[model samples]
Target: TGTGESKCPLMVKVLDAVRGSPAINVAMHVFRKAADDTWEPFASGKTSESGELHGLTTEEEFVEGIYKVEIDTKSYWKALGISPFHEHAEVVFTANDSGPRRYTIAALLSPYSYSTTAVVTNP
Candidate 1:
């Protein structure tokens, strides 16, 4: 996920679990809240050498709804000569809250494994 023009934006990194390896220049897509509690296409980008998507969503664009980032990890893993267990990886989060808040999310990626976690900052 790339940062959206907000300091509170979500940033993502891809790492291999056991080897503690980092993948670079991987493709990813971001979605934001659209209409009727549905998701809409937000941003599409590839990770830098550091494997971080700068900002996934903007503070203004962040609405109380379901949001997600799709990672094309198969291509990345294939580049490393590994058989991809899954065709793609997805990380999802919700922005619904009455009180003020911010979020950060990341994906731990591998050929046969994937997981993620997020943090909600009370702003």
Candidate 2:
């Protein structure tokens, strides 16, 4: 869970392991659909210590529609002098019905590849 002041109160954890690199810099943006069926930016954050970024938009700010999360992987890799297979990684998910749900979204990133998945709650 996150603080109420956040536009979206979700914790986003991003990690990228590039060979021979000390650390990777990551930037992320959260998007939501408007009534006019257009996607708009709700909030944004950058990865910090241990590649973990907290304080995302809260579920209350989101409607029952599609939401998108985009990560700036290219610039991060570029800063590390590495070339990635993709410049960015985007994940689109639906809110459906909201409650006390926990979504663990993660990504496996490297100089040449990346992958992500939605995790489940323990209990």
Candidate 3:
């Protein structure tokens, strides 16, 4: 069984719509779906200067289930002294395949709105 490092590569990026700048060092949370179809804490980290967080999941967390990446829109705006009409933004993705898969997810947050994207690199 090839249980080594999986091909399940992932990256997350956040941007400030108003400033048009990377959300440097913004905290983000990652959750994996459990057997009972409930959310469970998987991984946690922050965005880098490039506004990206890479390799956030483990091979163990790549089983057939759902994953959620959440960002606090209100908190991020509050820290920047800006107003946030949205409380949060999140991306939910599914990972159920015959082998390891690649994924890329992004989040865009503005004072008045927020958005998310989930892309599978391989079919």
Candidate 4:
């Protein structure tokens, strides 16, 4: 009944601007930056009906590193019979840089525009 995860290390929320509701069933992919500057797949999941996705990674797996969340925006809009401008929405940032923490990434999406925000808290 809330917008964030209480136990998971990472949570994602997506809202559909046009529909004024949660963006249900959107695909997401997670990646971690490798030592060689390449991105390696870490975890993946689809948003629930509440527009929230959690449990993608554990506290042990999500260590200090650069990570990226790739949202399949194109397919999401395409399924709704609307064409989107971007192929995907990607958010990249360094996680657990200082100490143990939890993250909530929220995104608002439209066919041609999108916005994102993140909340970081101590675990």
Sliding window of 10 residues with minimal summed lDDT for model 4: 1-10
Model 2, runs deviating above 4 Å: 1-9, 19-24, 96-98
Q: How many backbone clashes does candidate 4 have?
A: 0
Q: By lDDT, who's the top model here?
A: 4
Per-residue accuracy of model 3 over 64-106 as CA lDDT, tens digit each:
7678888767777899788678667777877756677777777
- Candidate 1's displacement at residue 75, Å, is 0.7
| lDDT value for model 1 | 0.73
Q: Look at candidate 4 and tell me the lDDT of residue 11.
A: 90
Ordered list by lDDT, greatest first: 4, 3, 1, 2
Runs in model 1 deviating more than 4 A are 1-8, 36-39
In angstroms, the error of model 4 at 98 is 1.0
- Which tens-of-lDDT digit does each residue in 1-123 have in candidate 2? 443345423556677565533234588887887889888887777877667665564555544667888988888888867766786888888864545455667777776777788875522
TM-score of every candidate = 0.79, 0.78, 0.82, 0.92
- Model 1 reaches what TM-score against the true structure? 0.79
The residue-by-residue lDDT of candidate 1 on 20-101, one tens digit each, is: 7666788888887666767678888888777677655666666577777888889987887888898889887666468547
- Assess candidate 4 and give its TM-score to the true structure: 0.92
**CA RMSD of each candidate after superposition:** 3.2, 3.3, 3.1, 4.2
What's the distance in Å from true for residue 61, model 1? 1.4
Q: What is the C-alpha lDDT of each candidate?
A: 0.73, 0.68, 0.74, 0.89
